[PDB]
Design a protein around this nucleic acid. Structure first.
Ligand SMILES: Nc1nc2c(ncn2[C@@H]2O[C@H](COP(=O)(O)O)[C@@H](O)[C@H]2O)c(=O)[nH]1
Ligand SMILES: Nc1nc2c(ncn2[C@@H]2O[C@H](CO)[C@@H](O)[C@H]2O)c(=O)[nH]1
Lengths: 436, 437, 437, 437
RNA sequence: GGCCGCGGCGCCGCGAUC
RNA sequence: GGCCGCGGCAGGUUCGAAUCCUGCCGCGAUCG
RNA sequence: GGCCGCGGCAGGUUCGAUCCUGCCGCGAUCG
């Protein structure tokens, strides 16, 4: 039965007592250090509401300073306080330079911000986090386990987190959904009837039809909490919910193992497909995931669009970011194209331009077709691999700011059996739909 | 060298020698003698009557004029009786109505029945128009016959003389109107350089204006376009030749180009460098007139071309040739081979019902979501243009024209690779690929 | 009493009652609910969406909008797939694209797939041009829905509403464009009296001018004639009705005419008095839609009518009728019986050879000369119009329309006399002969 | 492994586990409690009472006894009332007579009213025999319950268990009589190898003899055939099964068979190799029980088959499937296409009266004499089996069964070619064509 | 799918119409 | 209620039906 | 800081512009 499955799930989902005592002792000690300095602070985030998922323990503390101190005034000051409270700290750059460190083994964040009267003086996202907490701290009580079930259900299917690496559901969005539908089970049941135009207005407690999938923030009606939830991940979630209800299982809460596959079998698969499968290798820029992945996504789309234009008929693309290198994977229906192509000339009555078009020397004679001139010309490349070698060599600049600059410094085109040796088997299996 | 020198030298290739003219006069006299014996009203029309016929293209046209009171059937009976009774060796041909083609003292002759109309307003049949055409031209073309012959020779040598569907070019009647309008061959070539696809040449009103298509107003019937069957591409070819001519005149324009005759090993080498897929569809030529066959060969080629487009084989050009026995549909494709797998479109994720059906079917690989919609990897039936066309010719033979489609249904085959170079199509392949000498 | 009062009362015959309106509103709401569950882009268009549908003719037209990237096959797959899922008791119909017709909460619904085009130039399909028609009228027709609704009822009551081949009248779209042009039903009727067979009505430019045909310019496409399939005769009828309507306004114009059925005995006496020959060609109705059948019944009757004209049976008028199981081609001729002997045309007296052949034939009677031509007395194969058609229909079945032709080849019979009046054709017979009361 | 171990292992797949028995026992004693409170005559019969129900097919049967002092109308009233006032979640099923079916503490139950009766000399309703059937078996089956279960499982695993019209196999009652007769499952299988279509098994007389048809004599009524609804073909499939089992015993005979799995492309290619015409008649499934639906599908499938034979399309076999919404009638024909023309037999040459009538019809070709009789060429309305069935389904809907025929009268569609392989009927197509894994 | 018109010599092909 | 086998009728197909295609009434059988 | 959507300029492609590419401004998202 479902009720027993969700009970079994709580084991994988709820943090153990040791993890709580580790955080509780880190919290109580973190306060003593903040009280002595006599600074205005507040505990928020998934910890303050006791909704953090198992293994993902993090303490979020916000410093509430007056409105008088503008921008860089409290930035450096709040940063200074973060050092005199944390053990092994390090400066991390978000919208505002905040401080990430550790206190008695537990990771901690210290973000400075304004102390605003109402959510009208909102400047940035950091100014909304306190209001998100204030709105949730009361309503979420007695539903902490419902949140964690949802967070686990999503993280197991790789769609938990609003960061660009995932483009899934935020922890804040999860809690809003539980407050709306009451429980995890009710959320999954109703999600089956979600569409790409569903509007979930939490504050007004109703569901409307809109222009896009829009979860209205109770703090700011103008804001979509699911703004970075991709359309596909929305589609995937709706489907996962449908599958869960038809045949409930604890498997939905356990992560999947990458498809084990021998390079020889993988070769035999590509042969059966008759496609060209290759990858663009290059060194990973030293930048944050929130900057890296949107760029890899761009570089992929750009090369993909180039392959379309050059009539190589690409099927799908993919990318992987390892420790030192990045890979842009492609699969095209055309292994090789004729050297000859057709270049369109002007209409026959346009004598001036026809003369210019015909003046160019070519191996074969131009011709007329539908009252317009045409000419046989030669391609510079006949394979998709050679085409991308050319594109990545001349159009490196449009492949993302940092990714484009790395490709400028170095890149290979790896295909055939040599590709299967690279650590990209998990993604090649995914984009081709290999099953076993 | 000089313009007038070339035009003078061109007349030799284009004017009938005095022997051919004598051959025609002798038949003409005998033909009139046999007709007068029968008490029928006739009229010598066409190229021969106006003395504007091309060298080695002698053919007499005689139209029989009957009262309007006659029925279509009576018109025919009297026509065929008088046809057979005047020609040494006749045969019944068809064109709107039956007429009699035959020979008289070596010279070929056409005897056509039509109504004797006083006003050019009672024109039901097109044959009823010919007497009016001749009537309008016999006076205005006098002195200009050599100019007409030049234009005809210029057009013929460049394969665009004749309004039949095999040529889709300039009719002889059209050539005469052009000379009457412009005054001479040279002046026609000159002004032709500024012809557009919207040019309207109205001889009867003596003006040039703009229209929706290239229109040559018939002086006999202003609603008729004399250049109706002049294709856009052949119009373009003519305008371009006229420019090429005035830029660098030459007697070569009036001579036919000997077909590109190359060996099957060089032809293999050209296709090799082009990197394309060249192949053909061989089948038996239907037993029909060219005016039926060629429009169907066109349709056949177009349909297969459109098929190759849809199937992503990326065709460059198509061509066709007709032997006395067989017919060939030629094609060149940029893709010699395509992958087995392809993307099959599924429903949007919101569809509980259809997504279930879509995912129900068995496939070698997992379907996936993209842009909020399900897609699935499926396999192609064919992976080369040759096999794709083989499949299409077998299943969609009916769309390749009536007579051509039925013939393909009985028997066809895909002659590809080097085996095709042995077939008699090399001249068409070189034209199709733009091969130089 | 006065025109304005008649119209005010005519509105009742024409506007949908509150119950029929609500019937649609409930279907619409349910239809939208189903379409939203599938995430498909759609739009309610046509007569219902603009709230101009005639009383009793409630029909909802939803158009599915797909990207231009979609292949025609994909366009059709998704369309059909969505239709069946949204309609209760669906029925696959065919036009330009295969679409789905069905029922939702007791209301008729059409679901047509098409392309979501931003440019009205990318139009290739007629279903692609519908979404543009709707948007051009959506704002303009607002506040005039009852004026359109009058024009429809006025037309339908006189059997000239609908541009199908069965009616060859005014389309619904045409009706709305005319109200937008003249402002109201009354202004449309008043000006229609001055229409001609050359009148052009430019809606976008809001001006009238002369042309070749009766042309109502589509605001979305200047090249298209909205009143293309409006027959010349139905045009004349509408003009006349408008003139008759203003000279003596009546609510009777907005009401259908009674069947006007008469006893077989009266009809027998009428034909006797007229002294004509009235017969029919009966045959099985081809299993084809009306749009294919009626143009063929028109051709069939026309061809047979022309045969009777050639054979001197002097046809007056013709008509046709399609029942459920059979089809009838009705004819009335002034000659019940013609002489067995007739004149056969021979050669002129000069033609010695052919006169010999002509006079050598065995004949009951001697040939003779008349106006320098030999004539002969020969015997007709048939001597009544029924005999003649029985022949022609069997030896020229192939010209009587494709489907109609093959059905006549399978089976047909010439019905006349008492046995014809028993067939379901009396209404058409009376209309043909101009019987009154 | 060997037979003894196979049957041992089979008991696992066959005997209900202690959890299923407990689920039933608690339901029984509870059901008895409610029958004692009202104080009504009742009896537990059927497979449950004798403890022979197959694994997973748990179903309690309880017959309500009533005195003979009741008419056929009074029994259902206080019969169903006692039924509804005993079952928790009850409904109403319709069989021989109205009866209540519902679930009681997990398991479903049937409450059938009937007369008590003294001896089987009455012989009236079918439900009046069930108590006598149980009484005859309850003593003789004790100690053989597992043998019964082995037979029932052996049959169900091969789709021939159950006397319902959807199966036309062996009834549960029949299975128990056989075990009583032969002593065990293994002895039944051994002797069944020598069964014929004329074998008579008399249980009460303990003898086998030859008769007119396969007949298992009911011990209660010698005139009744217990295996009456066992089809001839299923009897054949059983005799063959037993022979295969004894020749090479295996546990696989007790496990149901795989669903096959085949791709549309292979299925298309197969049909191409057969050179046959495969198509289906698709329509909406009438909302009726299987026992009414399947016999009608058999009738419709048969009627159309006989039509295909009669129309010389030479059908090979026919199959049918019933989904939740639609029903399919599958057919395969050796003739994809037939000539337009055919022969019709006329009268003998002496019969002048009828020769005149026969020769009066308008036909495309001349009739001819052959062996003294007159014959005539005539034209078919259709030339393919698809189109032939389309005509037949349209004009003979009424004979394709009551409910099925009515649903076809409303809507049906002929699905041929590759489009048929998309429908959910691949399993039925593979079985029909004898496609091997 | 059928119908009309155009073009070439009723047979074919192409535009318009439902 | 539906299906099946006979018995008596009533239409349709056909030049013409005891016979081929259908429908109604009566009896028997099967299944729920 | 990066990415995405708009708005306005500027190179390139090309026979010439549809396409490609860059710069500035506004808004959105993530850190
Ligand atoms: N179609 C038709 N066949 C008949 C008719 N009467 C008899 N037959 C059939 O004609 C054939 C010859 O008749 P018989 O000599 O057997 O009486 C037989 O097959 C017989 O059944 C009838 O009225 N119509
Ligand atoms: N009227 C008619 N009788 C036939 C035919 N064939 C056989 N017969 C038989 O011939 C006999 C005529 O007396 C009857 O027994 C008929 O059944 C036929 O084609 N027409």
């Amino acid at each position: 039965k479902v009720e027993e499955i969700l009970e079994k799930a709580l084991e994988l989902v709820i943090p153990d007592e040791e993890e709580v005592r580790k955080g509780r002792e880190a919290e109580e000690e973190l306060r003593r250090r903040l009280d002595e300095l006599g600074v205005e602070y507040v505990f928020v985030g998934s910890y303050a509401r006791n909704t953090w998922l198992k293994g993902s323990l993090e303490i979020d503390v916000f410093l509430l300073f007056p409105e008088e101190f503008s921008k860089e005034e409290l930035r450096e000051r709040g940063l200074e306080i973060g050092k005199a409270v944390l053990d092994s700290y390090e400066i991390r750059y978000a919208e505002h330079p905040y401080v990430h460190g550790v206190v008695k083994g537990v990771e901690v964040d210290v973000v400075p911000c304004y102390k605003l009267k109402e959510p009208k003086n909102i400047k940035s996202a950091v100014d909304r986090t306190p209001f998100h907490h204030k709105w949730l701290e009361g309503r979420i009580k007695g539903k902490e386990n419902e949140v964690r079930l949802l967070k686990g259900f999503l993280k197991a299917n790789g769609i938990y987190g609003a960061e660009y690496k995932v483009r899934g559901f935020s922890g804040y969005l999860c809690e809003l959904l539980i407050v709306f539908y009451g429980s995890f089970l009710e959320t999954v049941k109703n999600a089956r009837r979600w569409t790409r135009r569903t509007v979930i207005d939490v504050a007004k407690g109703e569901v409307r039809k809109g222009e896009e999938f829009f979860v209205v923030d109770p703090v700011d009606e103008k804001r979509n909490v699911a703004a970075n939830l991709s359309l596909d991940n929305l589609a995937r979630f709706v489907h996962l919910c449908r599958e869960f209800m038809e045949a409930p299982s604890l498997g939905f809460f356990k992560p999947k193992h990458p498809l084990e596959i021998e390079p020889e079998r993988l070769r035999k698969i590509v042969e059966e497909r008759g496609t060209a499968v290759f990858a663009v290798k290059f060194r990973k820029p030293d930048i944050v995931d929130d900057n890296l992945y949107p760029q890899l996504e761009r570089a992929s789309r750009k090369i993909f669009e180039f392959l379309e234009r050059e009539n190589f008929m690409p099927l799908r693309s993919a990318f992987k970011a390892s420790e030192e290198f990045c890979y842009l994977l492609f699969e095209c229906q055309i292994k090789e194209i004729s050297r000859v192509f057709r270049r369109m000339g002007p209409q026959f009555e346009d004598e001036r331009n026809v003369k210019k078009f015909l003046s160019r020397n070519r191996a074969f004679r131009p011709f007329i077709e539908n009252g317009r001139w045409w000419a046989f010309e030669m391609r510079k490349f006949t394979t998709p691999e050679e085409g991308v070698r050319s594109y990545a060599s001349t159009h490196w600049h449009t492949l993302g700011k940092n990714v484009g600059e790395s490709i400028r410094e170095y890149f290979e085109i790896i295909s055939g059996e040599k590709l299967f040796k690279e650590p990209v088997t998990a993604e090649l299996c995914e984009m081709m739909g290999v099953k076993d």
